[PDB]
Structure 1
Amino acid sequence: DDNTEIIKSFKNFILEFRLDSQFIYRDQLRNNILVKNYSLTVNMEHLIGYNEDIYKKLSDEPSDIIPLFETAITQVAKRISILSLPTFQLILNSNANQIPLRDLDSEHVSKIVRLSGIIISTSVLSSRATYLSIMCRNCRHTTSITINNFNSVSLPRSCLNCGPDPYIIIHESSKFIDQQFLKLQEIPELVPVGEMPRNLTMTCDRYLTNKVIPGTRVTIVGIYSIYNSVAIRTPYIKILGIQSDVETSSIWNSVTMFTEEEEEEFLQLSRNPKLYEILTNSIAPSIFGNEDIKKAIVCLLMGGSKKILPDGMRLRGDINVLLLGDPGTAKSQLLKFVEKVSPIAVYTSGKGSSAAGLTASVQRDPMTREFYLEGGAMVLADGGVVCIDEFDKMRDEDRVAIHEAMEQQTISIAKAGITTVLNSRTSVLAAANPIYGRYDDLKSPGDNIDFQTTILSRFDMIFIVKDDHNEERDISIANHVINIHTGQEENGSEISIEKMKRYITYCRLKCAPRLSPQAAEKLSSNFVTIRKQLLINELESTERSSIPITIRQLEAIIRITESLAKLELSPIAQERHVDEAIRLFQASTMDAASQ
């Protein structure tokens, strides 16, 4: 009765909506059916413009009208693609105000809401039924049921004598769809005073599955509903749309999510003669000086290139950076910026961490009594960067639990039957203090550093930041900080965080330069000289150097060269990059070792 009229109304929107000379939804449908994507994304501002009455119904009773807009889409799709196809999914976009995760309460039950959060977990896909074929136990009578996944359905209780519940499902004739579960945590800043962050369970269907990964900020449009698991119901959100700032699909598979128009911008930016300067200036615009550390951070974000030799050996392609220095140097602020610019990043404190917190931990499911594996900081940061602050407060065991994941980029587990070798391809950016809090020049370098040579050799570049009291520099820093406190270039000398992050993603998924012979000869000669320099320094002092120079440093120089080449989308690394890489190595690691 009314259902047919509602279906007719939503069908006329898809067939009559033109903003100029193009039918936006009719053409979107045809283009989607051609690539086998049975869905239509509709913007709710367009529906409020066609007929406000249709929006009033879709917002007053969402779980009753949404199922009738899907069938209208399916009918129009059949009319457009078939010359005389499952039920089509409807994905919604809205610009309504976002309700804070913790402000959702009884006043929003069964209503369309928009909210943001952080995805902390994702489930293994399940299978939900969409068309059952049933039969009767006694008289063997065949029937079918059709189900929409919008709850306010079960097998018939009485046959069509036959006892109660006479119907058994015939599986080889039924059809199913995909279902996923997500946990959404509220943003750290939104949380009220003295409160732990709160979770919320979410479910997505069909083409909204496998769209997010744990640890990524997302925006959700859905229905705040309830399901019975006494007179209380556990709330949850039925997703109707997902929007994210991270192209997770490009990151897991190939290069994707870059439009040709967007791609053209990246090539134009790469063609800039002084992209290195722009990127260096774009990191921490509010921190004065420390240019070398900012260049090192650019190289770390860019990364090197990984090689798999024919015999099977793999060569690490990531760069690890350590910041040792005195208080007030802005190491923690640099780490907090790097966590915010990188596409994937985790900020962790060495004190509030553990060996299982990093890597992976073995957990027991209370229901199935079965042990399973949950990823830690280094798994949650896979393919990105881990910012381990307070690296000196970490316990010896928890620090030792990081060697293999830092070098081999794998997390071997052998616990509770579970036996595996996970993958953790992450870059470590660590900040630490010397033993006495300040780097005391009076005592030998072996007295100011408690890190063992094994852990230190795993860092590509080591920065020993010393705070020297110079009146000119002090006045400059005072002026800069006061300007910050009392007080937008965007004129080719700096790019916002979003653009820089997208450019990092593009470069990582598009380029992997290789060394030319001249660079190889140059780097090889430099390694021989540096090793001789360590030996002359060692012969002079009975004490064995605390900062080592092993083959890992040669590989680190190669990685820095490759990252500098990749920064400009150059398929080959030339001497103009080798010189910069050698300069950075001398400015950080040989500088630390010389003292």
Structure 2
Amino acid sequence: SVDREEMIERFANFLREYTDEDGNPVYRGKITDLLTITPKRSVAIDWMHLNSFDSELAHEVIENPEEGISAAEDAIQIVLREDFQREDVGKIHARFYNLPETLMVKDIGAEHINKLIQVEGIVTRVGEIKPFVSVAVFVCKDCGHEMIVPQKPYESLEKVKKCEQCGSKNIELDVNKSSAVNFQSFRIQDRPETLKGGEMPRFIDGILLDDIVDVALPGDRVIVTGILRVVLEKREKTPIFRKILEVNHIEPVS
């Protein structure tokens, strides 16, 4: 694979240098647009673009999407600092779309676990929009020490048992110091027309965070990309994985 430091470099280079068929510096422009008075909170990257410019890296995104996405976001940040002298920009997401293969929900095997997959389906349900504690901040009631603990929207809350400074077992989550983002669950499944007669359609539950929340309603036909996550299903006696799609990019089909 490719270590983080070097991905950031390669990504930063891609954003700056990539140009399309007509010579348009697509991502330079997208990043420039971040200086507009009401900017976007993400930059969508066409996987095919990245694959034609630095293929080895493009495949790393699919193999290690967590590090891949993270590096890409770190690069956006340094391009904003080095090329636009903007520091206070806040989080900008890297959302990859147009992957080489589109799976049906039924195709999502366990060989995909923790990779970036692209799935086409119809939205069966959407949850209500709630605040997800993306960063929990715990505060000791004795020394007043602060412990930052990032969370994952598919795993249960990672608490702290004792203070990392004064060993005290008197800590609570500080609701104000903690950071919260929008969260919305949804479900997609294969449409019956895509299957054989009397075949039971399969489904998968996803998570939308931040700015891609509330972009789809039930009945919508979508192409999502995301990391396939598995967590142990507590509904079952025996160890069964419950699949969750942590969505990286979502758009309707046409």
TM (normalized to structure 1)?
0.38
The separation in 2 between residues aligned to 1:206 and 1:173, in whole angstroms, is 18
Displacement of 1:245: 4.4
For 2:152 and 2:18, locate their aligned partners in 1 and report how far apart those are by CA, in whole Å.
27
Superposed, 1:244-283 pairs within 5 Å as 244-245=252-253
Greater RCO, CA 8 A, separation 6+? 2
Q: Which has the higher strand share?
A: 2
Q: Is the 8 A contact 2:121 2:188 kept in 1?
A: yes
- Counterpart for residue 543 of structure 1: none
Structure-2 residue corresponding to 1:134: 138
> Deviation at 1:120?
1.7
Greater helix fraction, Structure 1 or Structure 2: 1
Which residue of structure 1 lines up, in the alignment, with residue 111 of structure 2? 107
Superposition deviation, residue 83 in structure 1: 5.2
**Matching of residues 539-550 of structure 1 within 5 Å:** none
The alignment of Structure 1 onto Structure 2 pairs a total of residues equal to 244
- Partner of residue 9, structure 2: 8
Map 1:417-566; keep pairs closer than 5 Å.
none
* Secondary structure in 1 matching 2:194: coil
Matches within 5 A, 1:74-89: 74-82=77-85, 85-89=89-93
Say what the alpha-carbon RMSD is for the aligned residues.
Answer: 2.6
The Cα of 1:193 is off from its aligned counterpart by 4.1
Matched, 1:122 2:130: no
Aligned to 1:30: 32
User: Partner letter of residue 45 of structure 1?
Assistant: M
Percent of counterpart pairs with the same letter? 19
**Amino acid in structure 2 at the alignment position of 1:238:** E
Aligned partners of 1:116 and 1:187 also within 8 Å? no
- The correspondence for 1:98, drawn from 84, 92, 102, is 102
CA distance in 1, matches of 2:76, 2:154: 17
Q: State the secondary structure of the residue aligned to 1:189.
A: helix
Are the structure 2 counterparts of residues 233 and 150 from structure 1 closer, same or farther at C-alpha, using a change threshold of 3 Å? closer
CA gap of 1:236–1:150, structure 2 versus 1, over 3 A, is: closer
Aligned twin of 2:240: 232
- Structure 1 residue 180, shift from structure 2 partner: 0.7
- How far 1:194 moved relative to its partner? 2.4
Listed as ranges, the matches of 1:173-192 within 5 Å are 173-192=177-196
Q: 1:58 aligns with which of 61, 69, 73?
A: 61
Structure 1: gaps of 5 or more residues: 247-595
2:40 counterpart letter in structure 1: N
State whether structure 2 residue 217 is matched by structure 1 residue 213. yes
Give the direction of change, closer, same or farther, for the CA distance of 1:80–1:39 in structure 2 (3 Å limit). Answer: farther
In the alignment, which residue of structure 2 is the partner of 1:43? 46
2:71 corresponding residue in structure 1: 68
Residue 162 (1) aligns with residue 167 (2) = yes
CA distance in 2, matches of 1:188, 1:180: 25
Deviations 1:61-91 (A, max 9, x none): 2123222222222232344444573221112
Render the CA deviation track for 1:450-495: whole Å, top value 9, x for unaligned.
Answer: xxxxxxxxxxxxxxxxxxxxxxxxxxxxxxxxxxxxxxxxxxxxxx
Flag the 1:231–1:28 CA change in 2: closer, same or farther, 3 A: same
What TM-score comes out, normalization by structure 2 length?
0.84
